Design an enzyme around this catalytic site. Structure first.
Site, PDB file in Angstrom:
ATOM      1  N   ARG A 273       0.569  -1.749   0.115  1.00  0.00           N
ATOM      2  CA  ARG A 273       0.074  -0.236  -0.032  1.00  0.00           C
ATOM      3  C   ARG A 273       0.946   1.686   0.135  1.00  0.00           C
ATOM      4  O   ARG A 273       2.051   0.998   0.076  1.00  0.00           O
ATOM      5  CB  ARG A 273      -1.035  -0.154   1.610  1.00  0.00           C
ATOM      6  CG  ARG A 273      -2.114  -0.930   1.346  1.00  0.00           C
ATOM      7  CD  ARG A 273      -2.417  -1.176   2.428  1.00  0.00           C
ATOM      8  NE  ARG A 273      -1.990  -1.873   3.678  1.00  0.00           N
ATOM      9  CZ  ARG A 273      -2.329  -2.303   4.924  1.00  0.00           C
ATOM     10  NH1 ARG A 273      -3.363  -1.462   5.223  1.00  0.00           N
ATOM     11  NH2 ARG A 273      -1.452  -2.408   5.874  1.00  0.00           N
TER      12      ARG A 273
ATOM     13  N   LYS B 106       2.330   2.551   7.799  1.00  0.00           N
ATOM     14  CA  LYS B 106       2.761   1.511   8.226  1.00  0.00           C
ATOM     15  C   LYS B 106       3.646   2.321   9.636  1.00  0.00           C
ATOM     16  O   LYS B 106       4.002   3.240   9.139  1.00  0.00           O
ATOM     17  CB  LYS B 106       3.051  -0.199   8.431  1.00  0.00           C
ATOM     18  CG  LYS B 106       2.576  -0.929   7.650  1.00  0.00           C
ATOM     19  CD  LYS B 106       0.796  -1.046   8.191  1.00  0.00           C
ATOM     20  CE  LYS B 106       1.055  -1.542   8.952  1.00  0.00           C
ATOM     21  NZ  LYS B 106      -0.359  -2.234  10.461  1.00  0.00           N
TER      22      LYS B 106
ATOM     23  N   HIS C  48      -0.352   1.486  16.091  1.00  0.00           N
ATOM     24  CA  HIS C  48       0.121   0.602  16.770  1.00  0.00           C
ATOM     25  C   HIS C  48       0.905   0.443  18.046  1.00  0.00           C
ATOM     26  O   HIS C  48       1.982  -0.204  18.421  1.00  0.00           O
ATOM     27  CB  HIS C  48      -0.351  -0.007  16.448  1.00  0.00           C
ATOM     28  CG  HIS C  48      -1.078  -0.623  15.517  1.00  0.00           C
ATOM     29  ND1 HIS C  48      -1.130  -0.955  14.524  1.00  0.00           N
ATOM     30  CD2 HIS C  48      -2.938  -0.897  16.127  1.00  0.00           C
ATOM     31  CE1 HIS C  48      -2.774  -1.023  13.172  1.00  0.00           C
ATOM     32  NE2 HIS C  48      -2.975  -1.325  15.161  1.00  0.00           N
TER      33      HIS C  48
ATOM     34  N   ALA D 126     -15.500  -5.529  10.683  1.00  0.00           N
ATOM     35  CA  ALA D 126     -14.603  -6.833  10.065  1.00  0.00           C
ATOM     36  C   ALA D 126     -15.414  -7.884   9.885  1.00  0.00           C
ATOM     37  O   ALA D 126     -15.649  -8.620   9.211  1.00  0.00           O
ATOM     38  CB  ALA D 126     -13.508  -6.856  10.631  1.00  0.00           C
TER      39      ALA D 126
ATOM     40  N   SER E 223     -24.084 -15.134  21.873  1.00  0.00           N
ATOM     41  CA  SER E 223     -22.672 -15.324  22.095  1.00  0.00           C
ATOM     42  C   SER E 223     -22.198 -16.006  23.210  1.00  0.00           C
ATOM     43  O   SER E 223     -21.244 -15.460  24.059  1.00  0.00           O
ATOM     44  CB  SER E 223     -21.608 -14.714  21.013  1.00  0.00           C
ATOM     45  OG  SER E 223     -19.879 -16.079  20.704  1.00  0.00           O
TER      46      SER E 223
ATOM     47  N   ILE F 252      -5.136 -11.589  14.146  1.00  0.00           N
ATOM     48  CA  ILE F 252      -4.300 -11.158  14.973  1.00  0.00           C
ATOM     49  C   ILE F 252      -3.267 -10.435  14.844  1.00  0.00           C
ATOM     50  O   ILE F 252      -2.310 -10.907  15.667  1.00  0.00           O
ATOM     51  CB  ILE F 252      -3.964 -13.058  12.999  1.00  0.00           C
ATOM     52  CG1 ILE F 252      -2.574 -13.369  13.506  1.00  0.00           C
ATOM     53  CG2 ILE F 252      -3.150 -11.469  12.297  1.00  0.00           C
ATOM     54  CD1 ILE F 252      -2.159 -14.301  14.878  1.00  0.00           C
ATOM     55  N   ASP F 253      -3.426  -8.757  14.932  1.00  0.00           N
ATOM     56  CA  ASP F 253      -3.000  -7.814  14.797  1.00  0.00           C
ATOM     57  C   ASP F 253      -3.050  -7.302  16.357  1.00  0.00           C
ATOM     58  O   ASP F 253      -2.224  -6.829  17.080  1.00  0.00           O
ATOM     59  CB  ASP F 253      -3.176  -7.126  13.774  1.00  0.00           C
ATOM     60  CG  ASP F 253      -1.876  -6.917  12.756  1.00  0.00           C
ATOM     61  OD1 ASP F 253      -2.862  -7.232  11.422  1.00  0.00           O
ATOM     62  OD2 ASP F 253      -0.701  -6.993  12.248  1.00  0.00           O
TER      63      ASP F 253
ATOM     64  N   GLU G 284      -6.670  19.165   6.605  1.00  0.00           N
ATOM     65  CA  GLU G 284      -6.465  20.277   7.907  1.00  0.00           C
ATOM     66  C   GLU G 284      -4.984  19.959   8.327  1.00  0.00           C
ATOM     67  O   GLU G 284      -4.173  21.167   7.991  1.00  0.00           O
ATOM     68  CB  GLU G 284      -7.645  19.387   8.587  1.00  0.00           C
ATOM     69  CG  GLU G 284      -9.085  19.581   8.149  1.00  0.00           C
ATOM     70  CD  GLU G 284      -9.769  18.582   9.048  1.00  0.00           C
ATOM     71  OE1 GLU G 284      -8.987  18.101  10.053  1.00  0.00           O
ATOM     72  OE2 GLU G 284     -10.692  18.404   8.027  1.00  0.00           O
TER      73      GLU G 284
HETATM   74  C1  LIG Z   1     -18.336 -14.915  23.555  1.00  0.00           C
HETATM   75  N1  LIG Z   1     -17.387 -13.769  23.392  1.00  0.00           N
HETATM   76  C2  LIG Z   1     -17.325 -12.433  22.165  1.00  0.00           C
HETATM   77  N2  LIG Z   1     -18.327 -13.565  21.302  1.00  0.00           N
HETATM   78  C3  LIG Z   1     -18.811 -12.804  20.283  1.00  0.00           C
HETATM   79  N3  LIG Z   1     -18.722 -11.508  20.460  1.00  0.00           N
HETATM   80  C4  LIG Z   1     -17.903 -11.315  21.320  1.00  0.00           C
HETATM   81  C5  LIG Z   1     -17.507 -11.380  21.996  1.00  0.00           C
HETATM   82  N4  LIG Z   1     -16.617 -10.542  22.765  1.00  0.00           N
HETATM   83  C6  LIG Z   1     -16.422  -9.461  22.482  1.00  0.00           C
HETATM   84  N5  LIG Z   1     -17.572  -9.626  20.970  1.00  0.00           N
HETATM   85  C7  LIG Z   1     -17.380  -8.647  20.240  1.00  0.00           C
HETATM   86  O1  LIG Z   1     -16.608  -8.493  18.667  1.00  0.00           O
HETATM   87  C8  LIG Z   1     -17.490  -7.250  18.181  1.00  0.00           C
HETATM   88  C9  LIG Z   1     -16.069  -6.713  17.398  1.00  0.00           C
HETATM   89  O2  LIG Z   1     -15.080  -6.379  18.582  1.00  0.00           O
HETATM   90  C10 LIG Z   1     -18.116  -6.469  18.967  1.00  0.00           C
HETATM   91  O3  LIG Z   1     -19.008  -6.393  18.291  1.00  0.00           O
HETATM   92  C11 LIG Z   1     -18.434  -7.155  20.231  1.00  0.00           C
HETATM   93  O4  LIG Z   1     -19.880  -6.863  20.738  1.00  0.00           O
END
Ligand SMILES: CNc1ncnc2c1ncn2[C@@H]1O[C@H](CO)[C@@H](O)[C@H]1O
Length: 371
Positions: free
Chosen positions: A15, A75, A96, A179, A220, A269-270, A323
């Site tokens: 990039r 980066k 980061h 994502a 979840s 992974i990052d 800006e």
């Molecule tokens: C079980 N543990 C989990 N399971 C599913 N999503 C989660 C989680 N812990 C955090 N998240 C979600 O991860 C998403 C993006 O980081 C957010 O929408 C959170 O609500």
């Protein structure tokens, strides 16, 4: 005022931090734009493209860093670049800092002013410069997961969408943020039976409306996650928590109970990844075994589609770049609080509380340098 853009130097980083459109807009506003020869080639932007837009093409990285008042990158500076950092310069790039004491120390010692793309944050809490990279990574996760499900890649040998009369891949996406949404969307478009897991039911409600229930949503709980993961052909880990490290939601014990040849793609992974067994790999050998499954843990995934991701990123950074160039860091940050939240270093002062506590070094209130 000169704005300089060097070639990215990290492994497979294709990039670039500006495009001809951005060059045109900067030069039109009276700024000189210095670009290292070849900087855009990874992204199919030729030196001639940049020059026609008004850029001054520079033979060496050293001159870009030396001549530029505003330095735009993709980066974080690597070790080879620390000696190029300068007191009188503004660096604007993904930093980061929590992941690198060395980079943090290099910036502070140089006394340079730096602003991190990934902590620029609007009032509504959104991260507008990280967002398009999350979108790219999510969509990529589906297509790389589909590819590694092929038996000739060590995968289970399952086609994403099946064919009539034959079961499609069972795809589980963990996380319904930017994502995860994009991963589920592409995986769904490929014909897979997609389930998205999140603890935020409002995000699941959004997915339910957008695809009229065609993308399955599951709350979840630990019980639910185990059950879904056990049945999956492909798991995409998309729980990216802004700031400190990712929770390990998928245990090696769980992985042992998964279907043989199942594929797990970690797009956090990052942040150490959200699978226990995750180690950051790269394009050379992108996958490794964990108990009869295949892990894909390539870091910096958007770098693999630079024609797309260079534009996605710089479209988002453009108004901030303009800006900063027009007004300097302090006035720009005073006028735009979203940009101020990105402020990372200035004159030896570390300006991120979160970075400071994660590294255990002192923090200087951003207000003290802006007001
Ligand atoms: C079980 N543990 C989990 N399971 C599913 N999503 C989660 C989680 N812990 C955090 N998240 C979600 O991860 C998403 C993006 O980081 C957010 O929408 C959170 O609500």
């Amino acid at each position: 005022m000169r704005v300089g853009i060097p070639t990215e130097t990290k492994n497979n980083e294709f990039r670039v931090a500006i495009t001809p459109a951005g060059v045109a807009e900067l030069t039109r506003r009276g700024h000189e734009v210095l670009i290292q020869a070849g900087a855009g080639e990874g992204s199919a932007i030729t030196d001639a493209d940049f020059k026609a837009a008004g850029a001054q093409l520079v033979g060496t990285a050293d001159q870009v860093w030396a001549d530029a008042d505003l330095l735009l990158k993709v980066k974080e500076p690597i070790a080879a670049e620390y000696g190029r950092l300068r007191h009188g310069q503004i660096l604007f790039t993904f930093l980061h800092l929590a992941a690198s004491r060395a980079c943090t120390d290099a910036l502070l010692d140089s006394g340079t002013t730096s602003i991190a793309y990934e902590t620029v944050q609007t009032a509504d809490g959104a991260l507008p410069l990280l967002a398009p990279m999350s979108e790219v990574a999510g969509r990529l996760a589906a297509q790389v997961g589909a590819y590694h499900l092929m038996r000739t890649q060590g995968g289970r040998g399952v086609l994403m969408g099946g064919v009539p009369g034959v079961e499609p891949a069972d795809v589980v996406v963990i996380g319904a943020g930017t994502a995860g949404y994009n991963a589920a969307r592409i995986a769904n478009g490929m014909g897979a039976t997609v389930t998205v897991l999140d603890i935020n039911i409002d995000k699941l409600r959004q997915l339910d409306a957008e695809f009229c229930g065609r993308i399955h949503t599951r709350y979840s709980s630990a019980y639910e996650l185990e059950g879904a993961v056990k049945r999956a052909d492909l798991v995409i880990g998309a729980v990216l928590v802004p700031g400190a490290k990712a929770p390990k939601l998928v245990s090696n014990s769980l992985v042992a109970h998964m279907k043989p040849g199942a594929v797990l793609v970690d797009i956090a992974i990052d942040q150490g990844g959200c699978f226990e067994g995750s180690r950051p790999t790269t394009y050379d050998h992108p996958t490794f075994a964990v108990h009869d499954t295949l892990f894909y843990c390539v870091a910096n995934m958007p770098a693999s589609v630079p024609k797309t991701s260079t534009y996605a990123l710089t479209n988002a950074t453009m108004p901030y770049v303009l800006e900063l160039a027009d007004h300097g860091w302090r006035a720009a940050c005073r006028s735009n609080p979203a940009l101020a939240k990105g402020l990372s270093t200035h004159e030896g002062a570390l300006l991120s509380e979160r970075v400071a506590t994660d590294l255990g070094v002192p923090f200087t209130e951003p207000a003290s340098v802006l007001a």
